[PDB]
Amino acid sequence: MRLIPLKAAAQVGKWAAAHIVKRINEFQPTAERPFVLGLPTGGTPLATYKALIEMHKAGEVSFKHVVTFNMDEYVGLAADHPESYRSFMYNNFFNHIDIQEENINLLNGNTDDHEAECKRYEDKIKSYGKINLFMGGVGNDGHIAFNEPASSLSSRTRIKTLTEDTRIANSRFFDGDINQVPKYALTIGVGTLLDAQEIMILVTGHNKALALQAAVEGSVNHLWTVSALQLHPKAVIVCDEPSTQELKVKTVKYFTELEAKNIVGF
Amino acid sequence: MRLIPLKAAAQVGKWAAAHIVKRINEFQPTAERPFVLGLPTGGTPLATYKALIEMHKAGEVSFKHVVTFNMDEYVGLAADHPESYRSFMYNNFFNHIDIQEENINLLNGNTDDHEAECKRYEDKIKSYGKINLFMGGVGNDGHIAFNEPASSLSSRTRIKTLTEDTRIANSRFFDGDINQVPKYALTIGVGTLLDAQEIMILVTGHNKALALQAAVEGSVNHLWTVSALQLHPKAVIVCDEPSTQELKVKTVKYFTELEAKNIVGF
Amino acid sequence: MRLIPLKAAAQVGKWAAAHIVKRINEFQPTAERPFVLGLPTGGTPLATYKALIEMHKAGEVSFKHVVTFNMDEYVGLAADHPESYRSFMYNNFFNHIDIQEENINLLNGNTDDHEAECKRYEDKIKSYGKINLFMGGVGNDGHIAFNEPASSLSSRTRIKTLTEDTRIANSRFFDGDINQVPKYALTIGVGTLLDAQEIMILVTGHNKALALQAAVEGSVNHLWTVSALQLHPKAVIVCDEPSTQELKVKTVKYFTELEAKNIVGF
Numbered sequence: 001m002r003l004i005p006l007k008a009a010a011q012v013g014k015w016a017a018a019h020i021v022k023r024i025n026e027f028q029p030t031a032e033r034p035f036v037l038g039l040p041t042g043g044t045p046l047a048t049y050k051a052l053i054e055m056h057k058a059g060e061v062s063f064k065h066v067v068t069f070n071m072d073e074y075v076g077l078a079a080d081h082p083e084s085y086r087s088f089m090y091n092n093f094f095n096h097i098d099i100q101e102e103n104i105n106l107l108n109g110n111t112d113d114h115e116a117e118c119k120r121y122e123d124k125i126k127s128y129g130k131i132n133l134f135m136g137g138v139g140n141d142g143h144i145a146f147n148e149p150a151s152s153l154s155s156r157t158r159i160k161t162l163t164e165d166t167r168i169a170n171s172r173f174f175d176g177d178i179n180q181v182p183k184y185a186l187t188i189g190v191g192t193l194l195d196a197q198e199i200m201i202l203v204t205g206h207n208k209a210l211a212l213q214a215a216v217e218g219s220v221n222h223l224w225t226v227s228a229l230q231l232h233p234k235a236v237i238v239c240d241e242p243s244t245q246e247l248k249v250k251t252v253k254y255f256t257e258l259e260a261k262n263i264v265g266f
Numbered sequence: 267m268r269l270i271p272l273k274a275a276a277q278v279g280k281w282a283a284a285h286i287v288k289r290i291n292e293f294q295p296t297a298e299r300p301f302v303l304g305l306p307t308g309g310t311p312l313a314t315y316k317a318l319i320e321m322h323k324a325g326e327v328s329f330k331h332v333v334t335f336n337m338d339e340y341v342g343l344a345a346d347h348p349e350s351y352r353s354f355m356y357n358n359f360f361n362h363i364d365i366q367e368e369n370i371n372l373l374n375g376n377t378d379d380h381e382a383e384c385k386r387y388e389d390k391i392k393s394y395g396k397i398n399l400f401m402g403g404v405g406n407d408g409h410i411a412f413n414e415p416a417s418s419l420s421s422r423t424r425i426k427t428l429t430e431d432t433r434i435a436n437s438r439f440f441d442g443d444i445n446q447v448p449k450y451a452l453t454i455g456v457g458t459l460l461d462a463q464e465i466m467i468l469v470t471g472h473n474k475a476l477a478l479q480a481a482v483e484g485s486v487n488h489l490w491t492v493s494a495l496q497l498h499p500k501a502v503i504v505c506d507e508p509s510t511q512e513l514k515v516k517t518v519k520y521f522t523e524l525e526a527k528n529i530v531g532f
Numbered sequence: 533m534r535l536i537p538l539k540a541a542a543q544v545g546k547w548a549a550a551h552i553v554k555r556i557n558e559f560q561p562t563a564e565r566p567f568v569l570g571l572p573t574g575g576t577p578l579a580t581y582k583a584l585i586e587m588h589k590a591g592e593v594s595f596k597h598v599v600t601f602n603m604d605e606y607v608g609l610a611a612d613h614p615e616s617y618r619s620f621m622y623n624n625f626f627n628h629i630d631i632q633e634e635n636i637n638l639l640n641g642n643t644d645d646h647e648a649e650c651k652r653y654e655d656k657i658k659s660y661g662k663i664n665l666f667m668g669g670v671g672n673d674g675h676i677a678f679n680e681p682a683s684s685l686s687s688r689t690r691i692k693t694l695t696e697d698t699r700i701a702n703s704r705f706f707d708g709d710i711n712q713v714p715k716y717a718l719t720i721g722v723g724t725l726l727d728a729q730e731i732m733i734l735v736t737g738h739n740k741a742l743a744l745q746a747a748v749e750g751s752v753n754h755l756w757t758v759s760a761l762q763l764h765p766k767a768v769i770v771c772d773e774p775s776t777q778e779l780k781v782k783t784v785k786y787f788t789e790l791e792a793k794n795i796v797g798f
């Protein structure tokens with residue numbers, strides 16, 4: 001894997017946005033061959049989305065032939081709720097770029113058959129072959145997507161129960177009221193994520209330091225599903241200095257020296 | 267994975283039996299499409315076998331179109347010895363249900379070519395496509411089937427050398443005389459087990475507490491081959507309270523809350 | 533996996549050479565069906581190469597229909613430098629056996645397109661189907677080939693940056709001058725190695741004791757890529773007593789008892 005150790009969250013967002021634009025522009029997407037981009041919600045990717053919007057306004061990237069898949073959606077929360085992941089993606093990203101409505105893919109957490117909706121989603125991914133780049137965050141508890149501790153490391157898309165830790169963290173988007181946070185979510189699996197050609201996980205803040213330690217220094221295990229990135233041929237973690245607090249000094253030095261020429265501009 | 271934390275071994279057996287009957291009856295097996303069930307010996311599954319026998323007598327399940335494969339057999343022990351795994355399975359299960367003789371599959375530990383017998387067994391599994399549900403136990407030392415510590419995590423069916431720890435445990439079936447316990451066994455591999463559609467491991471007693479800790483809280487490693495369940499898309503561990511002694515309090519609480527609605531009847 | 537615990541490095545070399553000759557002679561290679569052998573450089577395999585040369589001189593093995601692939605080559609070092617891996621292999625092995633020039637495969641570290649050279653190498657392996665036996669060593673830091681800490685466990689052949697630890701170790705071949713040791717190498721990946729039918733890693737000396745502990749007692753992780761052998765169906769580690777210093781007493785006893793009949797002649 002690559003670990004990109006940057007100083008501040010603003011730089012993580014600039015690096016991630018530049019990496020997405022690099023992959024899209026080198027791919028040269030068309031209607032017949034779209035670039036397929038997997039996307040997360042949460043607080044971590046906001047700077048990346050804002051950077052991508054500005055790069056599009058400057059004519060540096062077009063999303064006209066970009067197909068997107070999101071990692072997850074809350075179960076039982078109204079789709080037009082401002083904190084649904086559908087609302088998050090339109091308000092923070094889709095409404096500000098030249099993406100096509102038919103190229104947006106989202107999970108519906110309010111159908112009468114969660115298993116059929118998750119299978120529909122997997123089938124739609126397979127209709128494009130592969131996801132070319134999947135961006136994600138990481139939970140305090142190590143999850144990627146909502147693959148909470150003790151998730152199968154070859155799981156597919158399914159309903160999952162959010163941990164109390166996840167719901168406490170996400171309550172900051174519900175006026176700090178954990179009773180407003182949904183208890184379940186539909187989420188792509190660890191196997192679904194590993195099927196992508198490239199995975200880029202953004203990690204910012206001291207709250208994620210134990211998760212980053214598990215990802216980088218820990219072994220492969222189902223309690224910290226971010227550790228599954230060790231199995232993937234093309235995984236990138238982009239992190240800020242507060243997220244490194246639980247790593248060894250030699251670990252940060254190793255990756256800082258490896259990436260020196262790739263971070264000196266950020 | 268799912269961890270089902272029950273109080274007592276009797277409940278583990280009732281839960282496991284109910285889960286097997288659920289899978290068989292939803293599958294609707296026929297002569298042309300049998301349900302393929304993998305089975306263990308040892309002390310742990312006895313309550314499950316007794317429960318399945320009673321459910322069959324009550325007309326709740328038929329094994330007429332169930333095909334079975336056992337995990338292992340001792341090498342060098344006479345097949346008609348009362349403690350051969352063949353004898354165990356007929357005396358404790360097959361002689362009491364409507365299973366068909368042609369649908370029973372067992373390893374022969376007394377041929378002149380162990381490798382050919384193991385390959386015959388693998389080829390017979392492949393003749394049915396997949397095992398639909400594989401029930402197992404766990405060794406004190408973490409083994410599934412007889413995949414003793416330092417087994418390949420992608421192993422196939424082969425002869426294995428039993429550890430002293432395993433032979434001491436199993437000597438309770440040989441009047442406590444370790445000199446009567448065979449030294450070798452033919453066993454399906456970790457890879458063979460992971461090829462099943464669903465794996466259900468039963469874990470009872472404080473002797474298994476270190477193995478359960480390795481399965482649930484440890485990382486993937488070849489010393490505790492039960493840890494390979496973390497790689498499987500559909501693994502279930504069913505355990506009693508004595509087996510949880512080495513887990514953290516928060517680990518037991520996590521799974522107890524997740525499964526609350528699924529255990530309240532047991 | 534198999535762990536072969538021998539006393540001294542000389543015995544490790546004799547065992548490894550005997551194992552290679554066993555695989556070649558049982559395979560019965562021909563021009564139309566060659567035996568494909570993966571090979572390492574470094575100090576560890578020298579005794580094995582010398583033993584293989586003597587066995588060939590004695591008529592016990594022929595390399596006429598053996599195809600070889602090496603693990604790696606330094607980037608930027610002249611190919612005719614005496615410490616290039618090309619020079620190592622010809623001077624220590626190829627010039628002393630009846631191998632055919634067209635059957636030798638080596639990475640070229642001095643082309644103008646490292647990615648194309650690595651892909652050429654992968655394509656050449658695939659032209660033979662599989663590598664039948666891949667011999668390797670292990671780095672102080674746990675690497676197999678030059679899959680340095682934090683390498684993908686499904687990596688393919690690519691350029692890698694050598695750690696300071698690796699360069700300090702290898703400086704003994706450059707008059708102790710770390711400034712003469714190349715900084716980069718082309719190396720087969722962890723995935724490339726795991727594609728072989730059988731892997732045999734030689735481990736000698738107390739400098740490798742932490743790496744052997746990670747391989748045998750540790751869990752699967754990308755910091756010690758030798759731990760990936762736990763995933764492979766047919767992995768063998770051959771070690772001497774100094775390399776076992778960080779293992780538990782019970783671990784050495786376990787493998788010594790398992791292999792007793794296979795080591796009593798060495």
Ligand SMILES: O=C(CO)[C@@H](O)[C@H](O)[C@H](O)COP(=O)(O)O
Nearest residue numbers: 040041042043044137138139145
């Ligand atoms: O799948 C997602 C959201 O789609 C989650 O895995 C978040 O990436 C994680 O919970 C971190 O959330 P933030 O810390 O970025 O809010």
Ligand SMILES: O=C(CO)[C@@H](O)[C@H](O)[C@H](O)COP(=O)(O)O
Nearest residue numbers: 306307308309310403404405411
């Ligand atoms: O494969 C089997 C038996 O077919 C073994 O893995 C046992 O499940 C394990 O040794 C536990 O045995 P008991 O504790 O249940 O006797």
Ligand SMILES: O=C(CO)[C@@H](O)[C@H](O)[C@H](O)COP(=O)(O)O
Nearest residue numbers: 572573574575576669670671677
């Ligand atoms: O791939 C190789 C060399 O082709 C390396 O992995 C070495 O096996 C390792 O660095 C040990 O080197 P020695 O200790 O044997 O010199």
Ligand SMILES: O=P(O)(O)OC[C@H]1O[C@@H](O)[C@H](O)[C@@H](O)[C@@H]1O
Nearest residue numbers: 150151152155159160161267268
């Ligand atoms: O093994 P997996 O697929 O990660 O999931 C295990 C359990 O995870 C829980 O979060 C889900 O609510 C359950 O439905 C599921 O059985």
Ligand SMILES: O=P(O)(O)OC[C@H]1O[C@@H](O)[C@H](O)[C@@H](O)[C@@H]1O
Nearest residue numbers: 416417418421425426427533534
């Ligand atoms: O790597 P595996 O297939 O688990 O087995 C390693 C060794 O395990 C031992 O128990 C067997 O007796 C040996 O024959 C075998 O070589």
Ligand SMILES: O=P(O)(O)OC[C@H]1O[C@@H](O)[C@H](O)[C@@H](O)[C@@H]1O
Nearest residue numbers: 001002682683684687691692693
């Ligand atoms: O994830 P991998 O393929 O092992 O490699 C990660 C990094 O490893 C470094 O050693 C290479 O110089 C980089 O080019 C590479 O990106």
